[PDB]
Structures are given as structure tokens and as C-alpha cells.
RNA sequence: CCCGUCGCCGCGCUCUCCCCCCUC
RNA sequence: GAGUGGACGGGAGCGGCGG
RNA sequence: CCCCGCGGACGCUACGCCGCGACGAGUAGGAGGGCCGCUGCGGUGAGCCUUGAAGCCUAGGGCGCGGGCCCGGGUGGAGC
């Protein structure tokens, strides 16, 4: 026997957009290389907006 | 064109087939001064109580920097205050053992978990023989067997530990990055006790297991690992 | 080209020779021994023969596949280790030394005493407990299924002559060569049939081992009986 | 005689018995089919020893001879020819059969374009 | 891609080309989405059921 | 757009099948008739095809031209070779490897027509 | 001509109190009961030889109803010159308390 | 393109010349 | 394909193979 | 400027494939996956079937951790 916990072994957060979409999914497929196949960070966090949910992409006013 | 990249790849696995000469050379000679080292140590202080005695006097000797702890009892009906010190000695399993750097601190901390765990005053043979036959190295969060230099220099070379005998040398002698050295070593999964034990239950000193027995850890090393 | 020199560094332990790295520089004189910088035809022409059908054919030796599976398999791993049979290292225990009488564990001769000779090129005994005693010719066997006693005969300055070899000792068969659906029966040439040269080298054998068994007394009456376990000695105890 | 598969490892099987289900031997009512214990004194589900085994995953099976028969093959079920054809580049991997609803005159025809394509049938004089 | 648009030819009842051409709609440029399909499909499918009780 | 198109059949096409743990794709020009988006026969500018003749012997090698995607009639370029397995293999390896048309399909059909052309020799009793 | 075997005796399997382990099973070789002369046996084939209804292939004869469980020795169990021993098939527990020939035959003497 | 007997590591010989001992 | 930097475009030089 | 050789395995359903490390008790309860299962509808399988559907029986052969499933034999007689 280990002494440790596993309530929090399994981190909670998105691998992949939860949509369907297939435009959505191809550019997934794009920044997924992109972010891996460079050392960008803005690749990084583009990848995983991609993934968020509506309510975590608000839209963006033109003010 | 061909022929001019062939030269810059065939310089290029020149230069750094010299630069491994290089740090293979320095690393011989790194251990071949720790041997050095080594037995200047262990001269002195049969030398220091040698010229004692010859005075009438008692020549005292440093009190140890460094323990070696084996946890000795399971995960089962630990109190909170136990549980928490055995976490931070890096002994959450049976039978893990884990180097300790010893002062006022670290001793309180071994008084409280003394139930659990036996400890003690590893010397040269056992250092070299946990680190050689259970050394591993937690390399990204993995544990990684120390099977090459490499895995070593990559992750601990910033202090200038860049092989298995500077990693040795820093834990043996305490150093100043005893810290990094012992942090990046994996806590030492030993066997149980060949020969069986004499009794979990209770301290050493009343025939049983548990507590400080000075350097009659490396008897119970042999015998784990 | 010069002669090749022998390894000038003794061994002194499997992996570790006597001298170092520096003392090695030396014996090899390598301080003037420094050196500084500085196929095979896939097609054959071949004349073809024939007015007007060109002079002669870019013949190609190893001519593509004419046929590919469906799949392959990936290839292996390197190793590193992992000789052949024919270049293992060959051990024989202490007690089996040329003239030990050993004692047959496994087979048509099963406990009969015979006469150790020489070990073989791939570890098999040469043994021969003469035919004349107990009806072992010159024959193989295996180091692990014979007992070494201590009693042993002087079998120096005889002769074992050169051709007893393992391949003189392979067995020889042949089944199927034209035969394929078996109704008629192949169970000929079933009987092996001792050799006159086999019958030779015995006799060749036999001739100086037999005069140095009977030199020390009842030996031949020892080599005659077998080898057996009465129900009140054991193995572990006894001395062989 | 019969195809061989590309590779015949040897397949190894954690477990060779059924897993059946806890008291379908005292009972007709209840078949053999597994069924998780619920209740709250079940001793099978508590683990007691010697006691009915309960499936879990370690008894998978490698994942290099997983639904991989004896001969070596994976079976794959087809119907018709056209069905058959599809195994043509999986020749010594995959084996096809034929469904049990097939006719006799058109289970024929499968073993025949088969037996063209080097394609394994499992069950290839099965009507006849 | 999305902004060429090609000349789509016409053809006669007799089946060959009969040379004229109209230019492709763009709606055959759209994006093609078959989960929104999908989805329309599947709730409009539900407007010509019968109730059974 | 091929990843595009492939995002639509890679679930949902009537030459899928999926049963027994595995998956093959039976439209006309896929090699290894699987159901993968390299060897997927529909949804390329360039696909190679490798069917027996239609006599029996011999195979057929069906490329796609470049320019009328969009019309299927005349899409795709049809020829029977007829030799020896060899040379068979070596004018597919040709037409693939030499035309850089689509090459990581150059064993692939290599492998099928030897498929074929094996299928065609008479049975073994 | 001769016996050539030591007898031995299938006492049973490693246990416990209340666990079998029958994959391994505990020999009694006659005239060995002290540990220290178990080192001659260890690694020496054994022979569980039992008759049966049915004819079986015999090596090197005639079909008999001679069938055998092969084995060999492994280690010494005990102080009193127990051993125990790896057969490719787990001994029967009806052969508890008969004859386990000891072969000699991967002999180290 | 008969075939990755390959990397790290530890060694031996040759591209130098003399001898010495068995053996053809 | 060949990357822990390569490219041109002239300065003045070496090291080795082509008197 | 590779060419006496014109040639060179597999792969990558990217919802795929591969590697490394640690871990694995569970009632009440929650979550995920299900190429587990039943019935019916829209598509699709140029699907299956009186040369024999469903159902049922079976000391028959197997697959899967499992839910279950496939195949052989028999019975059955119209659908799956
Ligand atoms: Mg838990
Ligand atoms: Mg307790
Ligand atoms: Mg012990
Ligand atoms: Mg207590
Ligand atoms: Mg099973
Ligand atoms: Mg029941
Ligand atoms: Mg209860
Ligand atoms: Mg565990
Ligand atoms: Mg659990």
C-alpha cells in the first residue's frame, strides 16, 4: 500500500472542443500541430480556446 | 555542395566526440580525486583518536550529518501528525528509505515518526551501493533508472553534479546542494529485510527495530537491498 | 601490411587487462605511431546474338521480386550477444578429466561404467567403455547425464584418432527424398548397419585401452557390471 | 495444407473458465450470465475467499492476441463475395467466415473465390 | 476554392452537352455542416408524427 | 477539400464497415480497402486503383486525371496490363513513382497487383 | 539392471494453514532429513509414474498405460530435508504419499 | 540494395622495427 | 531529408591532392 | 550535377498511432465508456432467405474482463 490520495489524480479540463463541428475540428487539427511543432506559447493558448466552450468565448464587442 | 556538407558533418562528429572525450576524462579524474577524499576522511579520524590516546584523552567525533531512514511499518492506523512527517520524509510505502540531512530540525522531526521507522548512520559502502543498485532519478515527474550520465548532468549539472560519483560524493558528504542532489533521487524502494526482523513493534535499544541504531543501519542495508 | 602482434596486454580478470590506458601507450609505442589525415557489378554486358538485334544486353544480376505478400513482418531488434551453437564457449566439470571411467544416467546404455577419451568440438563426450567389456563402442554423450567417478586409468600416449569428430558421429538418415503421399510404406533401410570403418576405429581404440585396464586389477570385471541403487544407500552419500 | 497466419505468437490466457454468476448453480431462474452482486451481506461481492471470482480488468488479454483464435487468424463475419473481397490485402491476418443465414448454393460460391484469394474460411464445408 | 465559382455545363435530353453553361450558384459554395443537418433533420422529422396514446 | 470531405465519411458512408472489432472501406479505388483518410478512393485529387481484368487476366491500373473533378464520366484513366508478374509490377511502380503521382501508394499497389495476379494462376489442389 | 532413482515421497503441496499453493509441491526423499544434504538433489529431475486406462506413446517402445508428470527440485524446504519441486502440471492430490522417482540425471558430480 | 553483426561504454591488432618460444 | 545558424561578394592567407 | 543497379518494408480510421512514468479496496452516491442487449422509424448494405427466415434444442468450435456475440448440427417453415 502508498499512502496517497487519488481524488485529484485526474485533472479536469478540455483535450478537445466538445463541438462537431468539422470546420471547428479542422482547425483544431491545424493548431494542435502548430502548437506542438513550435515553441509558441500564443499557439498554446489559442489551442486550448479553441476547446472552451461558448460560455468561456464570449463575443467581443467592436467598442 | 555535396562534398562541402559532408566536411562541416564529418567536423561536426569530430567536435563533439572530443567534447565526450573531454567529459569522460574529467569525470575519471573526479572520481579518482573523491577516492582521494574519501580515504583522507577516514584516516583523519582514526589518526585524531590515535594521537587522543596517546595523550589520555578521548577524542570526540562529529556528530554524523547524514542518516539513511527506512520506514519499518504500513499505512494502517496512522496518526495525522505521523502521517504528515512521513510525507515529508518521503516515506509513504513500507520499506522506502530516504536520505535525511541531520540537524535540530530534521531530528524532531525523526523523534515524532520514531514508531515507524528506523534510521541510522549510513557509511561509504552503503551510499555507493543504494545509489548503484536502487538509484533513480525523478527526471520530469517520472521515475527514471540512473543508467547513463546523461540523465544525471541534464537535470543536476547547474550544481556541478555530472555523474554517479558527484551524486555519491554530495550525498556521502552532505555539500551544499545536498538538497537538489537528494530531491532528484527517487525515495529508495528496498526489498524487505532478508534474514527477517527482530521486532517491528518496538524500539531498538529493547531488541526491537524501530529508532536510531547508530551504524547498525548498514547491517539492516545488506540485508534490504 | 605488417605481422599482427599478440595482444600485449595479459589478462588478468575476465574484461580487465594488467595494464592501463598509459602503460598500454607505451607497449604499443604509440607516442611515434601517429598518423595523419590521408564494387560489386550488379549488371554484366553480355553479346545476345543476331543480325540487327543489338550489339548486346545490360544483363542484371538480382532481378526484382515478381511477387510481393500481402503484409511483411518488421524486422528485429540488435542484440549484441547471442552467438551461434558452433561459437559457444565449451566447459567440462573438474572430474571429468581423459581416462575417467563415468557412469552412463540416460539412454540404451543406461548404467553401464564406460571410458572418458576427449570432449568433442561441441561439448558431447567421446566415450568408450570397450566394446568387449560391456558393449559401448565409440559413442557420444552428454557431460550432464554421466557420473564422474574417481577411479581413472592413464590414457596418455594413446592415439584417438583425428577423424572421430562430430560430423563422424552425426547421425544419418534419409526419409521422403521422391516419397511424398506415404501408402506405400518407406520402412526401409530402417536398420542402421555398422560401418566396416566404425568396426576400424574400435578395434584402433580398443587395442591400447584394454592394456592399460587390465594393468590394474579387477578393473575389467568393474567396467563389466553396472551401476545401481540398493535401497539402503543413497546418492548424497556416497563418494563416487 | 491450410493458410498460415503472417505471425503465430503464442496466446496466452489469463483465464480459461467462465466467469459465472453467484448462485446460478442453486437455481434455474438464474442463468449463468454474469451479474454484478449488489446486495448489502453478499460475500461474493465483499471478496471472500474461496467464494465465486468476480470479472475485473486485470484479467485482460494482451493486446497483440486479443480475438485471436487458435490458428492464429481474426475472423471477419461476410456475407457474400463482394463482402469476401475486402480481406484480399489482410490475407494472413484476418480469416473470413460465412453467416449462418447464407444459403448452401451461395456458401459455395464464398469458399470458391475464397480459395482463389488465399483467404481463410473458418467454416468452409458447412453445407454440404 | 470557395471564391471560384466554375461554369457548369447543361445538357440536352439526349444527354450530351448542348453548349450552354450557366455560371455555379453560390450556394453550392456554403459550408457544409452535417451536424447542424443533423440536427434539423432529426427535429423536423418529429413534425409529421401522429400522436398515439 | 480532402481532410474536409473526410470529416463527413469518416463515420458515415455506405462503403463502411465496421464489424469485428475492425473496419474496411469498400468504395472502387481504395488499396488495402480500409477505412483510412490516406487510402480512401473518393475524396482525393489523385487516387490510384488496382482491379483484376475483366477477362481474368491481367490487372487494371485506374489513376484520376487532374482537371474534371467534378465529372465523374471521364474522371478516371483506365488501362490493362497484361504481361509478366514483374514487369506488371515494374510498369505500377513506374507510373507511380516516375509520374510523382501520389507515391505514398506505391507499395500499396504494388503489393495488390501481385495479389491479383497471384488470385488469377490456377488453385493449388 | 538397477533402480536409479532415489524414492522419494509426494508429502503435499506449499501451503499454509489454510492457502495451497499447489503449483509447487514438497518432496521426502529417503535418507535425506537435514537441510544440508539437500544441495545434492537440487535441480535433479523428477518423476511422478503413474498407470492409467488408456494406451500412451512411449518413447523409444511399445504403447503402455505408463504415464509420467516431469519435474525437477528447486530448493530445499524446511530443516528436515524436505525439498520442493516445479512439475509442468500440478501433481494430483490423489498422489499424496506415493512414489516420486529423483533421476540423478542433470548431474553436477 | 544477400544483409542496419548498430549507438554509448571497455578493450586488441595493423598501417614502425627488432628479437624470444612452440609449431608448418 | 540532413537541421545545435546558413547564405554571398569582393579583402589576405594557410592545411592536403593535381610542375 | 548519385546513378554499371532507376530502386528501397510498415505507417497516419489524427475520434488514429506511438513512447515513458506512477497508480489499481469500496457501501450510500456521482460520473464516463459500452463494436453490450430489446423494440420501432429515417438512411444505407445492387444486404440475407423456400438450395430454407424467425424461434427453439445441442457431451459441437470459438471470441470477449464482462454485458454478450459469432460459427457447426438438429428441428422449424417465412420472413430477418
Ligand atoms: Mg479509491
Ligand atoms: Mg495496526
Ligand atoms: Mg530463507
Ligand atoms: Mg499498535
Ligand atoms: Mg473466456
Ligand atoms: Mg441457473
Ligand atoms: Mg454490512
Ligand atoms: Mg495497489
Ligand atoms: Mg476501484
Given at each position: ?63 | ?20 572525450k573531454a567529459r569522460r576524462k574529467l569525470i575519471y579524474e573526479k572520481a579518482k580525486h573523491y577516492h582521494k577524499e ?124 555530472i555523474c554517479?560519483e558527484d551524486?555519491?560524493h ?56 | ?19 592501463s590506458r598509459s ?218 | ?128 | ?53 | ?125 | ?109
Amino acid at each position: 500500500g502508498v499512502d496517497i490520495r487519488h481524488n485529484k489524480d485526474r485533472k479536469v479540463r478540455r483535450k478537445e472542443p466538445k463541438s462537431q463541428d468539422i470546420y471547428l475540428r479542422l482547425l483544431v487539427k491545424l493548431y494542435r500541430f502548430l502548437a506542438r511543432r513550435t515553441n509558441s506559447t500564443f499557439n498554446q493558448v489559442v489551442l486550448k480556446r479553441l476547446f472552451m466552450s461558448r460560455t468561456n468565448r464570449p463575443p467581443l464587442s467592436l467598442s | 555542395n555535396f562534398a562541402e556538407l559532408k566536411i562541416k558533418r564529418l567536423r561536426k562528429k569530430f567536435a563533439q566526440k572530443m567534447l565526450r572525450k573531454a567529459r569522460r576524462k574529467l569525470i575519471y579524474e573526479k572520481a579518482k580525486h573523491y577516492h582521494k577524499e574519501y580515504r583522507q576522511m577516514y584516516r583523519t579520524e582514526i589518526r585524531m583518536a590515535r594521537m587522543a590516546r596517546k595523550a589520555g584523552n578521548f577524542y570526540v567525533p562529529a556528530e554524523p550529518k547524514l542518516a539513511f531512514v527506512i520506514r519499518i511499518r504500513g499505512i494502517n492506523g496512522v496518526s495525522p501528525k505521523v502521517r504528515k512527517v512521513l510525507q515529508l520524509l518521503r516515506l509513504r510505502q513500507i520499506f522506502n528509505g530516504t536520505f535525511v540531512k541531520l540537524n535540530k530540525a530534521s531530528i524532531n522531526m525523526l523523534r515524532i515518526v520514531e514508531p515507524y521507522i528506523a534510521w541510522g548512520y549510513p557509511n561509504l559502502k552503503s551510499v555507493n551501493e543504494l545509489i548503484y543498485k536502487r538509484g533513480y532519478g525523478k527526471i520530469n515527474k517520472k521515475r527514471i533508472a540512473l543508467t547513463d550520465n546523461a540523465l544525471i548532468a541534464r537535470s543536476l549539472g547547474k550544481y556541478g553534479i555530472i555523474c554517479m560519483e558527484d551524486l555519491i560524493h554530495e550525498i556521502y558528504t552532505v555539500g551544499k546542494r545536498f538538497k537538489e542532489a537528494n530531491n532528484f533521487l527517487w525515495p529508495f524502494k528496498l526489498s524487505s529485510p532478508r534474514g527477517g526482523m527482530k521486532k517491528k513493534t518496538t524500539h531498538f535499544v529493547e531488541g526491537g527495530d524501530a529508532g536510531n541504531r547508530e551504524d547498525q543501519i548498514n547491517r539492516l542495508i545488506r540485508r534490504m537491498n | 601490411k605488417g605481422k599482427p602482434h599478440c595482444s600485449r596486454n595479459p589478462v588478468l580478470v575476465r574484461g580487465i587487462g594488467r595494464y592501463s590506458r598509459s602503460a598500454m601507450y607505451s607497449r604499443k609505442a604509440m607516442y611515434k605511431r601517429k598518423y595523419s589525415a590521408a564494387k560489386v557489378l550488379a549488371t554484366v554486358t553480355k553479346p545476345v546474338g543476331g543480325d540487327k538485334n543489338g550489339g548486346t544486353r545490360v544483363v542484371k544480376l538480382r532481378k526484382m521480386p515478381r511477387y510481393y505478400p500481402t503484409e511483411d513482418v518488421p524486422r528485429k531488434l540488435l542484440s549484441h550477444g547471442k552467438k551461434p551453437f558452433s561459437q559457444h564457449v565449451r566447459k567440462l566439470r573438474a572430474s571429468i578429466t581423459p581416462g575417467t571411467i563415468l557412469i552412463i544416467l540416460t539412454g540404451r546404455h543406461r548404467g553401464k561404467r564406460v571410458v572418458f577419451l576427449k570432449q568433442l568440438a561441441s561439448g558431447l563426450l567421446l566415450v568408450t567403455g570397450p566394446l568387449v567389456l560391456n558393449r559401448v563402442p565409440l559413442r557420444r554423450t552428454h557431460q550432464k547425464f554421466v557420473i564422474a567417478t574417481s577411479t581413472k586409468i592413464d590414457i596418455s600416449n594413446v592415439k584417438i584418432p583425428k577423424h572421430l569428430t562430430d560430423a563422424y558421429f552425426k547421425k544419418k538418415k534419409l526419409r521422403k527424398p521422391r516419397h511424398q503421399e506415404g501408402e506405400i510404406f518407406d520402412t526401409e533401410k530402417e536398420k542402421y548397419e555398422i560401418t566396416e570403418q566404425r568396426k576400424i576405429d574400435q578395434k584402433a581404440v580398443d587395442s591400447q585401452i584394454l592394456p592399460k585396464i587390465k594393468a590394474i586389477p579387477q578393473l575389467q570385471g568393474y567396467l563389466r557390471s553396472v551401476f545401481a541403487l540398493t535401497n539402503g544407500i543413497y546418492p548424497h552419500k556416497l563418494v563416487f | 495444407a491450410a493458410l498460415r497466419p503472417l505471425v503465430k505468437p503464442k496466446i496466452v490466457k489469463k483465464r480459461t473458465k467462465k466467469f459465472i454468476r453467484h448462485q446460478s448453480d442453486r437455481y434455474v431462474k438464474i442463468k449463468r450470465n454474469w451479474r454484478k452482486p449488489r446486495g448489502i451481506d453478499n460475500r461474493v461481492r465483499r471478496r471472500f475467499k474461496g467464494q465465486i471470482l468476480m470479472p475485473n480488468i486485470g484479467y485482460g488479454s494482451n493486446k497483440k492476441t486479443k480475438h485471436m483464435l487458435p490458428s492464429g487468424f481474426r475472423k471477419f463475419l461476410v456475407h457474400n463475395v463482394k463482402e469476401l473481397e475486402v480481406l484480399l490485402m489482410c490475407n494472413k491476418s484476418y480469416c473470413a467466415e460465412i453467416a449462418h443465414n447464407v444459403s448452401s448454393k451461395n456458401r459455395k460460391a464464398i469458399v470458391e473465390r475464397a480459395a482463389q484469394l488465399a483467404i481463410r474460411v473458418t467454416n468452409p464445408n458447412a453445407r454440404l | 476554392m470557395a471564391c471560384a465559382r466554375p461554369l457548369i455545363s447543361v445538357y440536352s435530353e439526349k444527354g450530351e452537352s448542348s453548349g450552354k453553361n450557366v455560371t455555379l450558384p453560390a450556394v453550392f459554395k456554403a459550408p457544409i455542416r452535417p451536424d447542424i443537418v443533423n440536427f434539423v433533420h432529426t427535429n423536423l422529422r418529429k413534425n409529421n408524427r401522429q400522436p398515439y396514446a | 477539400s480532402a481532410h474536409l470531405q473526410w470529416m463527413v465519411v469518416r463515420n458515415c458512408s455506405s462503403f463502411l464497415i465496421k464489424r469485428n472489432k475492425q473496419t474496411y472501406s469498400t468504395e472502387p479505388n481504395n488499396l488495402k480497402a480500409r477505412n483510412s483518410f490516406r487510402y480512401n478512393g473518393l475524396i482525393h485529387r489523385k487516387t490510384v486503383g488496382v482491379e483484376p481484368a475483366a477477362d481474368g487476366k491481367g490487372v487494371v491500373v485506374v489513376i484520376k486525371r487532374r482537371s474534371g473533378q467534378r465529372k465523374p464520366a471521364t474522371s478516371y484513366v483506365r488501362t490493362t496490363i497484361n504481361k509478366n508478374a514483374r514487369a506488371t509490377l515494374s510498369s505500377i511502380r513506374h507510373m507511380i513513382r516516375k509520374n510523382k503521382y501520389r507515391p505514398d501508394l506505391r507499395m500499396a499497389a504494388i503489393r495488390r497487383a501481385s495479389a491479383i495476379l497471384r488470385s488469377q494462376k490456377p488453385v493449388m489442389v | 539392471s538397477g533402480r536409479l532413482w532415489s524414492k522419494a515421497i509426494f508429502a503435499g503441496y506449499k501451503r499454509g494453514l489454510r492457502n495451497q499453493r499447489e503449483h509447487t509441491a514438497l518432496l521426502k526423499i529417503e535418507g535425506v532429513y537435514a537441510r544440508d544434504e539437500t544441495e545434492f538433489y537440487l535441480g535433479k529431475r523428477c518423476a511422478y509414474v503413474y498407470k492409467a486406462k488408456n494406451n500412451t506413446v512411449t518413447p523409444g517402445g511399445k504403447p503402455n498405460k505408463t504415464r509420467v508428470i516431469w519435474g525437477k527440485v528447486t530448493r530445499a524446504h524446511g530443516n528436515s530435508g524436505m525439498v520442493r519441486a516445479k512439475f509442468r502440471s500440478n501433481l494430483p492430490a490423489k498422489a499424496i504419499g506415493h512414489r516420486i522417482r529423483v533421476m540423478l540425471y542433470p548431474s553436477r558430480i
